[PDB]
Design a protein around this ligand. Structure first.
Ligand SMILES: N[C@H](CO)Cc1ccc(O)cc1
Ligand code: NA
Length: 657
């Protein structure tokens, strides 16, 4: 029997307690041959009747209605505890057992796939993890909290990973529990954020009610709240018998944004199992004392009218459920290979490094135009660090991932990579030591992708979301900033770092590294404020590395200075130049004062505030000194970095919007 297109729709729809866009569901049924349903799970190893029987009923309906059904096995998290214990292979077996309960429960596997997160993710780490960070980048942290006093660790990440899966697999339908609602809804919202008309339909299935009064769904910490598949028939009888069983008809449970089942005095888990585990089966009906009830409704009518006695209804269900489970018990009884997985599942129920030589770590500012004051700061800390530790090493990280996460500059990968390579090239030319190694985050991730993201979560699971919000000042811009912070600590540990250097632009972020390693990693702070903005105290009035010679002149012209001033910006810059060089000479025509070299900043002030060091002569000498000092750098603007600069002005254009 081939179902007509209306009957296919009806059958697939029946799966869902809600359907987000039935129109979308239809058009899928009407146009698309191998509609993708996906659903996912972390192998627990103790399978309840909803995972065994009910899922199978719904998988079968989807394959019937002409879907391919992909199971996403979230086994990736097993890698956390893998170096010790090797829990990946153990969780694969728990999974393999689950699939095998599924075969024997009657899942038609013809059109059903199983994918392993561990296998799949690590085969396209690039495409996956970049999307994870983008989903965070484009979303307000408040909105990622809704997918989960204030206890929240970095479980802000789990939703992003989940939301990624949806796109990674190319799911057309999300056929998961109603409680996964908000993550799935996030995916629909995300399509909009990437100009993508076709959206995933959310076909949320019912959450089975807990057996005892006041338990909206099954309880992990109460075995009698649900029927489990390894429950021998005496257990089934005992669990049902005591079950809550109101004499009330069972209307739909109006949906909360949360997806979260709510226990009520009206809901009857005996009647829920009868709807979900019995009648949901294509041809099945329940029989009590010689009468057979064709629909769930008929049985309900019976119970409430008082034709079927509570004891009898529960007797019916027990016979019914042992009937569904018996095939599955024999199979594990007789199929050795099956049995072994079980006894394996049973047995499982048995319950950093400091670098010898010092090494500093600095993060290049993800900025389009880098101030000279920040640049010089970086060069100084480097030179200071090396002098203090000549044996040691310094490393500059270009954050070509984390900076995309935080929505830095345009928040586009190509723009940000360009901004970094240019400004870093300029920084080396401006005087950053050769001895300093330059590495990109991409280089560090590829280097050890598996371990990197594992570390990221490991760290994540030991710290509160609120704390990462503190690190950023208490508010975060987007959920991507949260990922950036974690990544930093991760990079630090992989780079085997003893010191983290921090510019003015890093704020407190980098302390995380220190706190995490329990103060083993020391913090070093940049020394800035030696080159101020050029305008009068109280724009393009800041000197940046990428200033060409035409730019400098303009800025040093506009720069504020008046006569008889002991302090202003042009003096500050002058005072700065004088310290590094060791001196500062200025050419003057005799009768304007004559040529005169200052080897001490006091003297400079002395002459400026009271005396005939005219500002014009000071600026002339300062402007020329910046030019001499910036030569190599500006040669790269017009030369080797010419092409890469193009992207940057294109970026700037965008952002002016
Ligand atoms: N989040 C669910 C319970 O932990 C399992 C899951 C479902 C779908 C996925 O793509 C990933 C995990
Ligand atoms: Na298959």
């Amino acid at each position: 029997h081939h179902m007509n297109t209306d009957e296919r729709y009806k059958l697939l729809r029946s799966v869902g307690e809600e359907c987000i866009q039935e129109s979308e569901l239809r058009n899928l049924i009407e146009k698309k041959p191998l509609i993708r349903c996906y659903d996912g799970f972390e192998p627990s190893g103790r399978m309840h009747i909803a995972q065994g029987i009910f899922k199978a009923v719904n998988v079968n309906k989807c394959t019937a209605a002409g879907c391919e059904f992909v199971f996403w096995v979230a086994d990736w998290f097993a890698l956390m505890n893998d170096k010790v214990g090797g829990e990946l292979e153990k969780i694969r077996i728990v999974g393999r057992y689950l699939i095998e309960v599924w075969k024997a429960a009657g899942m038609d596997m013809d059109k059903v796939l199983f994918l392993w997160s561990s296998e799949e993710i690590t085969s396209h780490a690039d495409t996956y993890w970049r999307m994870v960070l983008d989903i965070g980048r484009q979303n307000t942290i408040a909105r990622i909290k809704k997918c989960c006093g204030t206890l929240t660790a970095a479980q802000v990440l789990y939703p992003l990973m989940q939301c990624c899966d949806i796109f990674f697999l190319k799911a057309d339908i999300c056929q998961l529990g109603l409680d996964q609602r908000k993550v799935n809804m996030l995916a629909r919202e995300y399509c909009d954020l990437i100009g993508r008309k076709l959206k995933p339909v959310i076909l949320s299935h019912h959450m089975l009610a807990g057996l005892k009064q006041g338990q909206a769904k099954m309880s992990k910490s109460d075995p009698d709240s649900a029927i489990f598949m390894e429950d021998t028939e005496e257990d089934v009888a005992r669990k049902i018998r005591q079950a809550y069983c109101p004499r009330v008809k069972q209307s739909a449970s109006a949906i909360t944004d949360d997806g979260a089942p709510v226990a009520t005095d009206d809901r009857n888990p005996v009647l829920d199992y009868f709807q979900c585990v019995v009648y949901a089966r294509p041809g099945a009906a329940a029989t009590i004392d010689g009468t057979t009830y064709a629909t769930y409704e008929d049985l309900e009518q019976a119970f409430v009218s008082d034709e079927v006695s509570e004891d009898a209804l529960k007797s019916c269900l027990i016979d019914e459920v042992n009937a569904l489970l018996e095939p599955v018990r024999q199979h594990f009884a007789s199929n050795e290979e099956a049995h072994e997985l079980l006894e394996a599942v049973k047995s499982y129920r048995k319950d950093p490094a400091a670098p010898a030589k010092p090494h500093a770590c600095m993060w290049m500012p993800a900025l389009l135009k880098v101030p000279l004051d920040v640049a010089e700061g970086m060069i100084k800390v480097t030179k200071d660090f090396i002098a203090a530790h000549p044996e040691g090493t310094v490393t500059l990280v270009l954050p070509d991932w984390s900076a995309v996460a935080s929505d830095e500059i345009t928040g586009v990968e190509k723009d940000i990579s360009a901004a970094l390579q240019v400004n870093c090239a300029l920084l080396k030319a401006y005087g950053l030591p050769s001895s300093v190694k330059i590495v990109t985050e991409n280089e560090v991730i590829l280097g050890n992708c598996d371990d990197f993201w594992v570390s990221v979560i490991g760290i994540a699971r030991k710290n509160l979301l609120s704390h990462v919000e503190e690190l950023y000042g208490g508010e975060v811009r987007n959920a991507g900033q949260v990922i950036a912070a974690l990544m930093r600590v991760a990079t630090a540990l992989m780079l085997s770092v003893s010191h983290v250097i921090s510019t003015s632009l890093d704020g407190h972020i980098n302390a995380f590294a220190r706190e995490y390693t329990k103060e083993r990693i020391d913090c070093v702070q940049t020394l800035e404020g030696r080159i101020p903005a050029l305008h009068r105290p109280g724009a393009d009035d800041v000197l940046y590395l990428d200033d060409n010679d035409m730019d400098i002149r303009r800025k040093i012209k506009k720069a504020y200075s008046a006569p008889n001033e002991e302090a202003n910006p042009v003096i500050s810059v002058a005072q700065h130049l004088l310290a590094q060089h060791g001196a500062l000479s200025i050419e003057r025509g005799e009768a304007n004062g004559g040529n005169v070299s200052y080897n001490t900043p006091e003297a400079l002030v002395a002459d400026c505030g009271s005396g005939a060091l005219h500002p014009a002569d000071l600026k002339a000498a300062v402007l020329q000194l910046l030019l001499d000092r910036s030569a190599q750098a500006r040669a790269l603007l017009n030369g080797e970095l010419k092409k890469n600069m193009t992207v940057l002005r294109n970026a700037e254009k965008k952002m002016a919007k």
